[PDB]
Amino acid sequence: LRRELAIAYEDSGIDLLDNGKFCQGLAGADGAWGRYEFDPLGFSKKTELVPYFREAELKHGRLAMLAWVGMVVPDFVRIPGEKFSFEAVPLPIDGHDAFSGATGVNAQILFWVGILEFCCAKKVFEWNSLEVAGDYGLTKFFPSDEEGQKKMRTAELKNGRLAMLAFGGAITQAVITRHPFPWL
Amino acid sequence: GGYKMSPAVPFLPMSPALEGIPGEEEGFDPMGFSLAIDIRWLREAELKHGRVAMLATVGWIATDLGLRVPGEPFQVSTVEAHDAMVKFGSMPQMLVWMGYAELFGFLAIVNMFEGKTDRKPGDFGLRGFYPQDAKGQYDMQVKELRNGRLAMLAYGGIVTTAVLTQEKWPFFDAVVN
Amino acid sequence: TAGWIGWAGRSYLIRTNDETKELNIDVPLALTCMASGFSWPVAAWQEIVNGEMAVPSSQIHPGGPYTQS
Amino acid sequence: LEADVLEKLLMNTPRDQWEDPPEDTYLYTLKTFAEVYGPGKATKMGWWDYFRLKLDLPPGFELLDEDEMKVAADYDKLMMEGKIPFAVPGPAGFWYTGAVIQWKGKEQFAGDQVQTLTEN
Amino acid sequence: DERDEGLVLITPEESGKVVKRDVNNNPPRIVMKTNDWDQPEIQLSTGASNQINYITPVVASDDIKAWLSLNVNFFSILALLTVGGIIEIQRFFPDTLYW
Amino acid sequence: SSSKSLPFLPKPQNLGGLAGGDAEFDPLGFSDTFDVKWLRESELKHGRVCMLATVGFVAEQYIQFPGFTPAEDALQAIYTAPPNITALLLFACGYIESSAYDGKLTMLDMFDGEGAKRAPGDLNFGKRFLPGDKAAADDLATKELSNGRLAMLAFAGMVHHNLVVKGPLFPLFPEGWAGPQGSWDLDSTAGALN
Ligand SMILES: CC(=O)O[C@H]1CC(C)(C)C(=C=C/C(C)=C/C=C/C(C)=C/C=C/C=C(C)/C=C/C=C(C)/C=C/[C@@]23O[C@]2(C)C[C@@H](O)CC3(C)C)[C@](C)(O)C1
Ligand code: KC2
Ligand SMILES: CC1=C(C#C/C(C)=C/C=C/C(C)=C/C=C/C=C(C)/C=C/C=C(C)/C=C/[C@@]23O[C@]2(C)C[C@@H](O)CC3(C)C)C(C)(C)C[C@H](O)C1
Ligand SMILES: CC1=C(C#C/C(C)=C/C=C/C(C)=C/C=C/C=C(C)/C=C/C=C(C)/C=C/[C@@]23O[C@]2(C)C[C@@H](O)CC3(C)C)C(C)(C)C[C@H](O)C1
């Protein structure tokens, strides 16, 4: 089960002994029909960093899940503004260059993201453990069962990885084709 | 029950330094500055900033609305008032007075840290409109802190927006695109 | 002014009489002597007259021995 | 500490120092921290404490290899035996000619008799 | 020492044997003597901890006053004030026109 | 124990027992560093010289001795006055200073051995009028100290007002006065930079 972060932080820090499980028993290594322990390069053999690896994986998955939808939506709809109009910016891939620099539109996003990351670094480093890796307490809609929680974590990880690859595919295809959503 | 979590950031444990101090209801310190610096110094600086920023906000609002003291040298806008009065000579004298008051504040801080006097971080002995009951005193200290924080943010916004848009204090009739 | 400086200094040295005080100045006493050095002419003449300025040469090292002992 | 790096560190360190290594050595750091951490002891460490421990413990590539230790030992043995692996100074350095000469002459304590190709 | 009051400070021999939490709910900390005058003791954490570790130095007004009482600071301040006075006299009354 | 005048600072402990210390006010610890007897003697001396100085500063602008060319700006009266008479004033001041303290004039000599039992500011001048009752005597001492301190501040203000106005004291704002901005004109670091 998942315990409140206050209780979970009681046993937190860089563990030195190793639970003898694949990746310390973390969720996300499960095939469709059986068990799929994917680690060809043996990165999980650094058991002390395994919690950091899971935190980074979940951060990347969530960020790419947002990024893919943010590459899809703008072409269909835009913010009601003159500088966000299709005439000022034809495709999402143009947004970075359009809003970089003195305009500050992307500078504000960078600033707020940096503030959020500065505030979350304490959990990322100090209070990171096998059970609280990627857990910020936003557990609304989280099932109240062990199997349900495990399945939800697996679904998050799988969708995050799918979007992690899909964002690379979509951004590369969009840069290559200069085309609307279908090629991204 | 485990650690005591910060109400501001529920996924972080409250810093023990900011317990029992006014403003602990929020318990906001995700970056852990209270774990590295003395909370007495932190609160003294916070209160100094809040008070100075409240005065600065009210002064900027007043000058932007108008209300200039009688005299020709003061017929300048708030943005250039700093340089105009530095040339005039008001600002050097004001800074001398600030140095005097801050010498006394520095003596207060030093004595507080050395324990010679049981002085609270921002306390200077002023008791005006101060409730007698302890709960009232706590509430008034929290009110001071929150008004000061709001004034810090408000002055930052006011000065930045004024310098950017070249408009008066409300900035409502400003063009942004 | 120069007599003021010299008097002050000599007075600090006489009052302290310690290498530790010479190294770590007793700033209160030093300031007191600096302030007091204003009457140095009268004070110095009085000490010279009364014998509190110079000590007999037999009380201080004369130098190297020039003869057999 | 990794098993391979531990083996390399033990090999590099003199055997007599394993019992109680000097204060300023990687083996001393390892002893001090293994006496406090491990099975039957503190099984967790703060992130910063672990970071500093990994900073101040040695990596594998920092310690000498078997071949390097053998080469150094052979060099020292040659010099102590009185033989010199011949070298000639070059530009801001010296080249090794691959030759071992007899540096000490017939009279071992005589500085006049040290052998050189130029005179001997 | 007031800083570490309420902290469970276990010696290296008791590491792992004592698991009682601190007043702040932190795990016990291992204390070691280093034989360094600058840092006589060093503490390691047994786990994630939420504790105050001041990075600011402990400076006393008495210590600062002693440092300034050191003959160097006394005489340097005296000489700086004297030089400033002479420079300001030169500024205010240039060329010694009075003489 | 917080000081009455500065309730956020520790109370000074070495200045007790002197009149005028009701609001114990020694934030910089001068009474701690030096002898309060000498400090109080100096304070009294400054007060007396300064109150006489304020009265003379006011009077000289209007009335002068027969001859004795006037100087509306009383700051220039020192230059305008007869040098021999000014030297006579200095001579009388020196005679009084030496005689009152018998020769123990310095920070160390005065209040040392004999003469330590003497009160800080007491020069045995006009003591016939001192009220017998200690309450009235202390009230009179406090009144003297208050008038002296006010006189010190007033003389400083008089001198600096004369400096800024570059003119006589009594007209506070001369004709066409616009402000003291242009008085401190010598180049400064920040001023020259900006
Ligand atoms: C036998 C024997 O021994 O004789 C006896 C005789 C007797 C009489 C009994 C004795 C006495 C006592 C005496 C002589 C006492 C004299 C007391 C005086 C002269 C007090 C002056 C105060 C001036 C003040 C406060 C000025 C304040 C000035 C201020 C506030 C000025 C303020 C402004 O100038 C400023 C600063 C700028 C201007 O532009 C504006 C204004 C407002 C004018 C003795 C000691 O027992 C000796
Ligand atoms: C070692 C050889 C090997 C190769 C060369 C290889 C190549 C590719 C390629 C490119 C050519 C793609 C595009 C691809 C894609 C997926 N592989 Mg796959 N794969 C290999 C091995 C396994 C194993 C052991 C498992 C597995 C799985 C999945 C899932 C299912 C995700 C899910 O729904 O959980 C997806 C999408 C797991 C599973 O359950 O598949 C039904 C699973 O256990 N794969 N795989
Ligand atoms: C547009 C633009 C910008 C940009 C950009 C950005 C954000 C770019 C992002 C790029 C990104 C995010 C690129 C991902 C690539 C992923 C790859 C290559 C994955 C390969 C994967 C391979 C080869 C194989 C995977 C697997 O074998 C594994 C390991 C195990 C198997 O079981 C399953 C399979 C076979 C699948 C700027 C700089 C911001 C502004 C500028 O103006 C222009
Ligand atoms: C930034 C911005 C905006 C804004 C804004 C905001 C939120 C602004 C907020 C401003 C704010 C919050 C300003 C508080 C001032 C408080 C003061 C001066 C208190 C003085 C209090 C004093 C002088 C008290 C003194 C005493 O307590 C002492 C010391 C001791 C006792 O004797 C008792 C007394 C009473 C005597 C707009 C307008 C919304 C839009 C625009 O586009 C951009």
Side-chain angles (χ1 to χ4, degrees), chain B residues 50-72:
Chain B
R51 300 160 170 162
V52 174
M54 294 156 100
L55 296 174
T57 299
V58 158
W60 196 290
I61 287 167
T63 56
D64 262 22
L65 276 181
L67 168 93
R68 257 143 199 79
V69 306
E72 178 75 1

mmCIF file of all heavy atoms in Angstrom, chain B residues 50-72:
data_model
loop_
_atom_site.group_PDB
_atom_site.id
_atom_site.type_symbol
_atom_site.label_atom_id
_atom_site.label_comp_id
_atom_site.label_asym_id
_atom_site.label_seq_id
_atom_site.Cartn_x
_atom_site.Cartn_y
_atom_site.Cartn_z
ATOM 1 N N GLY B 50 9.457 43.955 5.003
ATOM 2 C CA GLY B 50 8.031 44.213 4.915
ATOM 3 C C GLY B 50 7.688 45.648 5.251
ATOM 4 O O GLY B 50 6.917 46.295 4.545
ATOM 5 N N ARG B 51 8.271 46.168 6.328
ATOM 6 C CA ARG B 51 7.985 47.541 6.730
ATOM 7 C C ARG B 51 8.493 48.533 5.687
ATOM 8 O O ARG B 51 7.766 49.451 5.272
ATOM 9 C CB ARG B 51 8.612 47.808 8.095
ATOM 10 C CG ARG B 51 8.090 46.895 9.193
ATOM 11 C CD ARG B 51 9.035 46.839 10.375
ATOM 12 N NE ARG B 51 8.441 46.151 11.516
ATOM 13 C CZ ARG B 51 9.129 45.659 12.536
ATOM 14 N NH1 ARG B 51 10.446 45.759 12.596
ATOM 15 N NH2 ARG B 51 8.477 45.051 13.523
ATOM 16 N N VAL B 52 9.740 48.358 5.243
ATOM 17 C CA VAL B 52 10.303 49.266 4.250
ATOM 18 C C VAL B 52 9.488 49.214 2.967
ATOM 19 O O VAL B 52 9.236 50.244 2.335
ATOM 20 C CB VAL B 52 11.783 48.927 3.995
ATOM 21 C CG1 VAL B 52 12.328 49.770 2.860
ATOM 22 C CG2 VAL B 52 12.599 49.139 5.253
ATOM 23 N N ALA B 53 9.057 48.017 2.566
ATOM 24 C CA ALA B 53 8.301 47.869 1.331
ATOM 25 C C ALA B 53 6.897 48.436 1.457
ATOM 26 O O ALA B 53 6.364 48.961 0.481
ATOM 27 C CB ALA B 53 8.240 46.397 0.931
ATOM 28 N N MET B 54 6.276 48.337 2.632
ATOM 29 C CA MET B 54 4.980 48.980 2.830
ATOM 30 C C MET B 54 5.103 50.486 2.674
ATOM 31 O O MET B 54 4.315 51.122 1.957
ATOM 32 C CB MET B 54 4.433 48.632 4.212
ATOM 33 C CG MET B 54 4.088 47.173 4.391
ATOM 34 S SD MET B 54 4.132 46.668 6.118
ATOM 35 C CE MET B 54 2.395 46.709 6.520
ATOM 36 N N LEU B 55 6.105 51.075 3.330
ATOM 37 C CA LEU B 55 6.307 52.513 3.190
ATOM 38 C C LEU B 55 6.601 52.879 1.741
ATOM 39 O O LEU B 55 6.060 53.861 1.218
ATOM 40 C CB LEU B 55 7.436 52.979 4.105
ATOM 41 C CG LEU B 55 7.188 52.813 5.605
ATOM 42 C CD1 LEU B 55 8.438 53.166 6.388
ATOM 43 C CD2 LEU B 55 6.014 53.658 6.064
ATOM 44 N N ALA B 56 7.445 52.092 1.072
ATOM 45 C CA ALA B 56 7.799 52.378 -0.314
ATOM 46 C C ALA B 56 6.589 52.266 -1.232
ATOM 47 O O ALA B 56 6.419 53.080 -2.144
ATOM 48 C CB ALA B 56 8.907 51.432 -0.769
ATOM 49 N N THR B 57 5.749 51.254 -1.019
ATOM 50 C CA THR B 57 4.557 51.086 -1.841
ATOM 51 C C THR B 57 3.618 52.268 -1.676
ATOM 52 O O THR B 57 3.122 52.826 -2.662
ATOM 53 C CB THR B 57 3.845 49.786 -1.469
ATOM 54 O OG1 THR B 57 4.711 48.673 -1.713
ATOM 55 C CG2 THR B 57 2.570 49.620 -2.279
ATOM 56 N N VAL B 58 3.362 52.670 -0.429
ATOM 57 C CA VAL B 58 2.463 53.797 -0.208
ATOM 58 C C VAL B 58 3.050 55.065 -0.817
ATOM 59 O O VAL B 58 2.332 55.867 -1.426
ATOM 60 C CB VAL B 58 2.167 53.966 1.294
ATOM 61 C CG1 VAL B 58 1.714 55.380 1.593
ATOM 62 C CG2 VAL B 58 1.110 52.971 1.729
ATOM 63 N N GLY B 59 4.361 55.263 -0.674
ATOM 64 C CA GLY B 59 4.982 56.451 -1.239
ATOM 65 C C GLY B 59 4.926 56.483 -2.754
ATOM 66 O O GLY B 59 4.640 57.524 -3.350
ATOM 67 N N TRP B 60 5.213 55.351 -3.398
ATOM 68 C CA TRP B 60 5.132 55.288 -4.852
ATOM 69 C C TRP B 60 3.709 55.537 -5.324
ATOM 70 O O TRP B 60 3.489 56.274 -6.289
ATOM 71 C CB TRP B 60 5.632 53.931 -5.349
ATOM 72 C CG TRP B 60 5.948 53.905 -6.814
ATOM 73 C CD1 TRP B 60 5.059 53.969 -7.844
ATOM 74 C CD2 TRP B 60 7.246 53.799 -7.412
ATOM 75 N NE1 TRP B 60 5.720 53.915 -9.045
ATOM 76 C CE2 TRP B 60 7.064 53.810 -8.807
ATOM 77 C CE3 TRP B 60 8.543 53.700 -6.903
ATOM 78 C CZ2 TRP B 60 8.129 53.726 -9.698
ATOM 79 C CZ3 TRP B 60 9.599 53.617 -7.790
ATOM 80 C CH2 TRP B 60 9.386 53.630 -9.171
ATOM 81 N N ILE B 61 2.727 54.939 -4.646
ATOM 82 C CA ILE B 61 1.334 55.159 -5.018
ATOM 83 C C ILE B 61 0.980 56.633 -4.890
ATOM 84 O O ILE B 61 0.342 57.214 -5.775
ATOM 85 C CB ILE B 61 0.412 54.279 -4.155
ATOM 86 C CG1 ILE B 61 0.530 52.818 -4.587
ATOM 87 C CG2 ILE B 61 -1.026 54.758 -4.256
ATOM 88 C CD1 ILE B 61 -0.091 51.836 -3.619
ATOM 89 N N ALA B 62 1.392 57.263 -3.788
ATOM 90 C CA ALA B 62 1.058 58.664 -3.565
ATOM 91 C C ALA B 62 1.693 59.558 -4.621
ATOM 92 O O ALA B 62 1.022 60.416 -5.208
ATOM 93 C CB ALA B 62 1.502 59.084 -2.166
ATOM 94 N N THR B 63 2.988 59.370 -4.885
ATOM 95 C CA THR B 63 3.656 60.198 -5.883
ATOM 96 C C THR B 63 3.056 59.986 -7.267
ATOM 97 O O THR B 63 2.866 60.947 -8.022
ATOM 98 C CB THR B 63 5.157 59.905 -5.901
ATOM 99 O OG1 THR B 63 5.373 58.509 -6.140
ATOM 100 C CG2 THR B 63 5.794 60.305 -4.585
ATOM 101 N N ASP B 64 2.751 58.735 -7.624
ATOM 102 C CA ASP B 64 2.141 58.472 -8.921
ATOM 103 C C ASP B 64 0.783 59.150 -9.033
ATOM 104 O O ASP B 64 0.460 59.741 -10.069
ATOM 105 C CB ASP B 64 2.007 56.966 -9.137
ATOM 106 C CG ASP B 64 3.129 56.395 -9.979
ATOM 107 O OD1 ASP B 64 4.206 57.023 -10.050
ATOM 108 O OD2 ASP B 64 2.936 55.313 -10.570
ATOM 109 N N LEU B 65 -0.029 59.074 -7.977
ATOM 110 C CA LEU B 65 -1.304 59.778 -7.974
ATOM 111 C C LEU B 65 -1.120 61.289 -7.993
ATOM 112 O O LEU B 65 -2.047 62.009 -8.377
ATOM 113 C CB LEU B 65 -2.120 59.376 -6.743
ATOM 114 C CG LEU B 65 -2.948 58.092 -6.831
ATOM 115 C CD1 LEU B 65 -3.707 57.870 -5.534
ATOM 116 C CD2 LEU B 65 -3.909 58.128 -8.008
ATOM 117 N N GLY B 66 0.049 61.777 -7.592
ATOM 118 C CA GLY B 66 0.291 63.201 -7.498
ATOM 119 C C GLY B 66 0.846 63.551 -6.137
ATOM 120 O O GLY B 66 1.825 62.945 -5.692
ATOM 121 N N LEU B 67 0.228 64.515 -5.460
ATOM 122 C CA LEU B 67 0.566 64.846 -4.078
ATOM 123 C C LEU B 67 2.084 64.960 -3.917
ATOM 124 O O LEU B 67 2.740 64.107 -3.332
ATOM 125 C CB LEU B 67 -0.015 63.807 -3.112
ATOM 126 C CG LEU B 67 0.459 63.829 -1.648
ATOM 127 C CD1 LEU B 67 -0.472 64.679 -0.798
ATOM 128 C CD2 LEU B 67 0.583 62.429 -1.080
ATOM 129 N N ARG B 68 2.638 65.993 -4.539
ATOM 130 C CA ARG B 68 4.043 66.324 -4.369
ATOM 131 C C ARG B 68 4.179 67.441 -3.346
ATOM 132 O O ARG B 68 3.363 68.366 -3.310
ATOM 133 C CB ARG B 68 4.675 66.741 -5.697
ATOM 134 C CG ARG B 68 5.527 65.653 -6.329
ATOM 135 C CD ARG B 68 5.392 65.639 -7.839
ATOM 136 N NE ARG B 68 5.817 64.365 -8.404
ATOM 137 C CZ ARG B 68 5.080 63.263 -8.401
ATOM 138 N NH1 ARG B 68 3.877 63.238 -7.851
ATOM 139 N NH2 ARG B 68 5.561 62.158 -8.961
ATOM 140 N N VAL B 69 5.209 67.346 -2.510
ATOM 141 C CA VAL B 69 5.423 68.323 -1.447
ATOM 142 C C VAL B 69 5.693 69.673 -2.100
ATOM 143 O O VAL B 69 6.243 69.717 -3.210
ATOM 144 C CB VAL B 69 6.579 67.909 -0.521
ATOM 145 C CG1 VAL B 69 6.362 66.501 0.009
ATOM 146 C CG2 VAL B 69 7.907 68.012 -1.246
ATOM 147 N N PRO B 70 5.324 70.789 -1.470
ATOM 148 C CA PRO B 70 5.537 72.090 -2.113
ATOM 149 C C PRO B 70 7.003 72.302 -2.453
ATOM 150 O O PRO B 70 7.897 71.935 -1.688
ATOM 151 C CB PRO B 70 5.051 73.093 -1.060
ATOM 152 C CG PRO B 70 4.167 72.315 -0.155
ATOM 153 C CD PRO B 70 4.705 70.922 -0.142
ATOM 154 N N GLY B 71 7.243 72.894 -3.617
ATOM 155 C CA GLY B 71 8.595 73.153 -4.082
ATOM 156 C C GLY B 71 8.782 72.767 -5.537
ATOM 157 O O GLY B 71 8.098 71.888 -6.067
ATOM 158 N N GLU B 72 9.727 73.434 -6.191
ATOM 159 C CA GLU B 72 10.037 73.194 -7.594
ATOM 160 C C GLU B 72 10.849 71.914 -7.779
ATOM 161 O O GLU B 72 10.579 71.150 -8.715
ATOM 162 C CB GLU B 72 10.797 74.391 -8.174
ATOM 163 C CG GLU B 72 11.226 74.231 -9.629
ATOM 164 C CD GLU B 72 10.074 74.396 -10.600
ATOM 165 O OE1 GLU B 72 8.942 74.663 -10.145
ATOM 166 O OE2 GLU B 72 10.300 74.259 -11.820
#
